[PDB]
Amino acid sequence: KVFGRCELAAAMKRHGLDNYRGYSLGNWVCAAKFESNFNTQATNRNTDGSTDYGILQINSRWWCNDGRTPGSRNLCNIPCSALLSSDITASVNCAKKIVSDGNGMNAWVAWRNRCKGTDVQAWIRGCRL
């Protein structure tokens, strides 16, 4: 599913990301924009042989099982394919663990490089939230 911007803002807010670990909703929407272009089906292989999955490009070395990432963990206890669903619940639950791990949203390198320090409330402009 390709979310609209305000559609995704509303879903992320419903699931508790606004101000989660102190990160306002626009940070999360900005991260999804540059990680996946709002596409839940996005996947991208990494040089280390892991893959990133879904709206927040959650990676198979630590967080989910894809069966092809040797000596990986599954700290979110899900199959990576769960992260591709139109229902973002599993991606949100796993993102909450990731952002709690010690480096905050710096775990998403698109957030660090394209969202951090910018006017992230622009991403929720106009939305009825």
Numbering used by the authors: 1 to 129
Provide text from the study:
Here, we have studied the binding of [VIVO(empp)2] (where Hempp is 1-methyl-2-ethyl-3-hydroxy-4(1H)-pyridinone), an antidiabetic and anticancer VC, with the model protein hen egg white lysozyme (HEWL) by electrospray ionization-mass spectrometry (ESI-MS), electron paramagnetic resonance (EPR), and X-ray crystallography. To structurally characterize the interaction of HEWL with [VIVO(empp)2], crystals of metal-free protein, grown under three different conditions, were exposed for 22–25 days to stabilizing solutions containing the mother liquors saturated with the VC. All the crystals belong to the space group P43212 and present one single protein molecule in the asymmetric unit. Vanadium-containing fragment binding does not alter the overall conformation of the protein.
In structure B, derived from crystals grown in 0.8 M succinic acid at pH 7.0, noncovalent binding of cis-[VIVO(empp)2(H2O)] on the protein surface was found (occupancy = 0.40). This vanadium-containing fragment is noncovalently bound to HEWL through hydrogen bonds with N main chain atoms of Arg5, Cys6, and Glu7, water molecules, and Arg14 side chain from a symmetry-related molecule. A site for noncovalent binding, close to main chain atoms of Arg5, Cys6, and Glu7, is also conserved.
